[PDB]
């Protein structure tokens, strides 16, 4: 298993533009296009991304650049969030991934606000952290995944997703 494959479960697949949880226009495996309201703004910015005029429809193909590119920023960030680096690289590898979905999620920014977590994670304290972590809007509003992703930081292993 890895962050493609754990991002793909977590994230899905759509062709078609779509709202996410949030009610926000998204695309592919959790490309948000805007916050904004506008299915017209939205069909822009798809367009803009893609390259061309999609009618708010692309290709696996396409879903799977984006995706591609998304990750790609995603480690991209952390490693340049002077909050992040240091947690990250203290991190074995399965965390890392645990790390990269959460950003992927919710920005850098707002992984950074699990400071209190991410410090107890810094300093190898499983099951403290991913207790602090469940207080969070983000469990609240997607148990499910928020679980998946609590587990995998907190034990170091795929269980949470096999
Ligand atoms: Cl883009
Ligand atoms: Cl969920
Ligand atoms: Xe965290
Ligand atoms: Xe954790
Ligand atoms: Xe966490």
């Known amino acids: 298993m890895n962050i493609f494959?754990?991002?793909?479960?977590?994230?899905?697949?759509?062709?078609?533009?779509?709202?996410?949880?949030?009610?926000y226009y998204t695309i592919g495996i959790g490309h948000l296009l805007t916050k904004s309201p506008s299915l017209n703004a939205a069909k822009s910015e798809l367009d803009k991304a893609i390259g061309r005029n999609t009618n708010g429809v692309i290709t696996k193909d396409e879903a799977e650049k984006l995706f591609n590119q998304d990750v790609d920023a995603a480690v991209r960030g952390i490693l340049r969030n002077a909050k992040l680096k240091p947690v990250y690289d203290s991190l074995d590898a399965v965390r890392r991934?645990?790390?990269?979905?959460?950003?992927?999620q919710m920005g850098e920014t707002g992984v950074a606000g699990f400071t209190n977590s991410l410090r107890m994670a810094q300093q190898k304290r499983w099951d403290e952290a991913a207790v602090n972590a469940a207080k969070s809007r983000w469990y609240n509003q997607t148990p499910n995944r928020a679980k998946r992703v609590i587990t995998t930081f907190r034990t170091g292993t795929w269980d949470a997703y096999k």
């Open 5 to 23: 494959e754990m991002l793909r479960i977590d994230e899905g697949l759509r062709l078609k533009i779509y709202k996410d949880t949030e009610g």
């Open 97 to 104: 991934a645990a790390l990269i979905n959460m950003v992927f």
